[PDB]
Amino acid sequence: IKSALLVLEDGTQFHGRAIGATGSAVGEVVFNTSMTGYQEILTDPSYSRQIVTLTYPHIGNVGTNDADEESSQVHAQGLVIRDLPLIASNFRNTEDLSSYLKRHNIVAIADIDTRKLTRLLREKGAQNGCIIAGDNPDAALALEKARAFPGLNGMDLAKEVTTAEAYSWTQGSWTLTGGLPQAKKEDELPFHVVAYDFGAKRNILRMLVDRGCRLTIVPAQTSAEDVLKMNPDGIFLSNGPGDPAPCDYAITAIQKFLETDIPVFGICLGHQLLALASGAKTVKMKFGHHGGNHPVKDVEKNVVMITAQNHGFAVDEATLPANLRVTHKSLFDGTLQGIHRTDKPAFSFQGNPEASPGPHDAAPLFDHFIELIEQYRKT
């Protein structure tokens, strides 16, 4: 009996079993509907300071493997599941999930009614919480920490997970057959895109590479000037944790790029920043979107795509400056999912075209970027 307990800001308690590291974890508690891809979710920087609840009951069936890592580490503050399986059963498995969590020092609880949890979050909106896994978990203590959490609203977390120094990436996507491929030689990549590291998934990077890009990842805080100084064929605004609003640096830099003709493409946090830099406004959603079965329609093409989502903030359609045209919307709630600068070659998508985990449906957004890129090059 290795107890664990989760408490939400509202006082709700869920008692279950510790399945990862001993300790405590505090963050905003969110639910994710993905039936597969827990590893990828766990390792997505966007999950920084968030407690991840997975609605699919059996989490861990296939164990874990290095290829399934979205970053160098597990960003999730903690993990909430209904059942950890007895065994992992998959040829790609290199380590069982409990071992993995422990190894990454993650506080995780199993055996709780995740449904009740999801229902509460849906109904009453997101809540901050705390998990204590240990000998005799203090429920009063957990509540206090939950209540003492500052919250993600107005919290800049991009600066917190960004790389320290700029780096070069030239590695493409995995294949069943060849796994993760060797990094390409710079000369084999026609384009050179400069990527803003706001807590980037490796998959974004790999998919850009697959399309002919060679990249330079730069810290969140890079200046426009240093950026422009590189003479990129395009600029990329990665996905990333927290409130996009506070990232004044990014916004400024961005505004800076928009004065030029360099194609700019943002994904998720990148989508919100572009929007902000364009004069739009962002909002914190009631509970946001985390799942991999989310329908988004390309309104310009009247077509639906099933996509991967992982965001708690959104761009207000209503405050859209005139130079921003709406390109996609959520079919589940009508929220804004895509925009394109009417006057500039800058566009972004709220969802995650790179998926990992999730449907490959939105991959094509990447192609528009290349398109833009090549066009800028024609010039």
Partner: protein
């Protein structure tokens, strides 16, 4: 889980292959794979309470028989799998014979070990924490009762005492991401209940027939559906209870409330417990609900239409033979014979030919 009927086809090859041989199917919903499986097992209407044993622990040839059933799947495979774990084979040895993914095999092994514990500890060791554990893994009151050597009703009372009852979750296509107004439900041993029953209406519950099998088909289901459509049309709140995934009775449009559950005494009483219906119909689902009638009434369920006693009077040959007599009707000459030589004579009495019916 598929429903077979090999017993009606003597000389048939009863091994499973690429050509279907099943005559029906049952479905179960559980928060876990073990809970789901077990519920399905008790819903199959083959008389199993879950992993009931096929061979004896003390049989010198059991491992050989077990081995054969695993290697060359029959309709009984699943039971044999558990038997294998009780006889000593490892997960790996089972895998090797069956090719069934270890992820499933381990769950069944874990259930066996839990059963061995119940058998050891007995009813005395069935404390609240353990029983709840057991319930969460989908063990049925009837399976627990056999292991602990008591009656099903005893496990049933124990749960009452501890206030250990399932809760109901709703089916909704989106893992609770959006709300729902359809009352399409399944039982589970969790915290929060989503049943939210009306206090408003007079309800009528119709019990389904479970998976289809030879002699218990779609015809029973048509009647269930009709009970539901007519009564709803009339103003009653209709509650359907069945777990045949193939049917119209299990379409959430057919009734006001659908409980997609095994049609067993345990499952039904849990529903009645919380629904408090005006009446329950046990006459439209075939043999399945027919057999629960008396038990249901004993437990105080408000059964409507022809009485359980009445049903019995007609279903019991002896009881039936007297009513016919009473009525002065005509029935063919009959006789209950025990011994062979007792028949041969009695036979002379009745006159051939004869309809020998065990």
């Amino acid at each position: 889980i598929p429903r077979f009927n090999f017993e009606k086809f003597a000389g048939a090859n009863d091994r499973l292959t690429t050509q279907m041989k099943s005559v029906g199917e049952v479905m179960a919903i559980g928060r876990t794979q073990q809970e789901s499986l077990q519920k399905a097992l008790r819903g199959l209407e083959v008389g199993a309470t879950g992993f009931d044993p096929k061979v004896s622990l003390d049989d010198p040839e059991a491992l050989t028989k077990i081995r054969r059933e695993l290697k060359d799947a029959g309709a009984d495979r699943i039971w044999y799998i558990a038997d294998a774990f009780r006889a000593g084979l490892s997960v790996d040895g089972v895998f090797n014979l069956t090719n069934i993914d270890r992820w499933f095999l381990v769950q069944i092994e874990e259930l066996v070990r839990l059963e061995e514990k119940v058998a050891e500890v007995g009813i005395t060791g069935l404390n609240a924490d353990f029983l709840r554990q057991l319930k969460r893994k989908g063990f049925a009151d009837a399976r627990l009762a056999k292991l602990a050597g008591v009656r099903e009703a005893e496990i049933r009372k124990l749960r009452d005492q501890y206030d250990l009852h399932p809760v109901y979750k709703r089916v909704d296509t989106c893992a609770a991401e959006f709300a729902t107004d359809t009352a399409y439900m399944y039982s589970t041993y969790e915290e929060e209940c989503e049943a939210n029953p009306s206090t408003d209406r007079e309800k009528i519950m119709v019990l389904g027939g479970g998976p289809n099998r030879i002699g218990q088909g779609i015809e029973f289901d048509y009647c269930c559906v009709h009970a539901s459509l007519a009564l709803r049309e009339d103003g009653y709140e209709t509650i359907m209870v069945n777990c045949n995934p193939e049917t119209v009775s299990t379409d959430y449009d057919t009734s006001d409330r659908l409980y997609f559950e095994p049609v067993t005494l345990e499952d039904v009483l849990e529903i009645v417990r919380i629904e408090k219906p005006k009446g329950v119909i046990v006459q439209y689902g075939g043999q399945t609900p027919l057999k629960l009638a008396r038990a249901l009434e004993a437990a105080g369920v408000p059964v409507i239409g022809t009485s359980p006693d009445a049903i019995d009077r007609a279903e019991d040959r002896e009881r039936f033979q007297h009513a016919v007599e009473r009525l002065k009707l005509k029935q063919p000459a009959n006789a209950t014979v025990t011994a062979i030589e007792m028949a041969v004579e009695k036979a002379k009495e009745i006159g051939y030919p004869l309809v020998v019916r065990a």
